[PDB]
Amino acid sequence: GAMGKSKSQDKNYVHAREIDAYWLQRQIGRVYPDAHIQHDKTTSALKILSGEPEKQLRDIENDLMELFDYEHHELVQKLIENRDKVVWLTRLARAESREERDTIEREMASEGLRWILDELYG
């Protein structure tokens, strides 16, 4: 139908090559234009999305919704749907040295994220 052709099929889709070192910050910055606040929220969002303390999905969602002031739920869900891509590819994009990139790539493979590396590198 016509409505379906007026927007993308999946508003949450983001290809691995799109996630540069500042992709997350730019998504947040559209809602929070202040440089300091958007950077704080980027740091916090990465920590939340990583699920590091063990964290359940319900907890990730709760914390992210509060981070976004109980608004912007579509952005919140987009980030959660892409949590592995956002966390890992942001980290990888920020890694300059051979050793650090290698470490990250091995860790991604160990986490079952070969699919993301295949997307990024072909």
Give an overview of the whole structure.
It comes from Chaetomium thermophilum (strain DSM 1495 / CBS 144.50 / IMI 039719) (Thermochaetoides thermophila). This is RNA helicase. It is found in: Nucleus. It is classed as protein binding. By secondary structure, the protein is mostly helical. It has one domain. It has helices at residues 2-5, 23-29, 35-49, 57-67, 73-81, 83-93, 98-110, 114-121. The termini are far apart.
Q: Topology of this protein?
A:
Blueprint: H1 2-5, H2 23-29, H3 35-49, H4 57-67, H5 73-81, H6 83-93, H7 98-110, H8 114-121
Helix pairs in contact: 2-3, 3-4, 4-5
Subcellular location: Nucleus
Protein name: RNA helicase
Organism: Chaetomium thermophilum (strain DSM 1495 / CBS 144.50 / IMI 039719)
Short summary:
It is classed as protein binding. The protein has 122 residues and is mainly alpha-helical.
